[PDB]
Amino acid sequence: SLSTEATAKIVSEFGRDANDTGSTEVQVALLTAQINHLQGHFAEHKKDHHSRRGLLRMVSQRRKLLDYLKRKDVARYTQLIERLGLRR
């Protein structure tokens, strides 16, 4: 879900605007930070056969998101991972 007062913080940092959450350097961050807020879900209970697809969805959209950023500008790519830390 990603709570709103974590989200607005992240968007205003990476982006120039507060509505600039459509730029790849921000799209990937809110996706990663969404999973970082979802860790509390897959850490406990374990059997979420429905939320399983949700994970595969947002993370796959991130694997290809990082795919084009990789092919277009390796400077902001290595900068995305250097400002948040979503490489490893």
What is the DSSP secondary-structure string of the chain?
A: ---HHHHHHHHHHHSSSSS---SHHHHHHHHHHHHTTTHHHHSSS---TTHHHHHHHHHHHHHTHHHHHHHH-HHHHHHHHHHT----
32 binds RNA (CB under 7 A): no
Q: Which of 6, 7, 12, 24 binds RNA (CB under 7 A)?
A: 24
List the x/- string, 69-88, binding to RNA by CB under 7 A: ---x----------------
The binding site for RNA (CB under 7 A) comprises 1, 17, 19-24, 27, 34, 37-38, 40-41, 44-54, 57-58, 61, 64-65, 67-68, 72
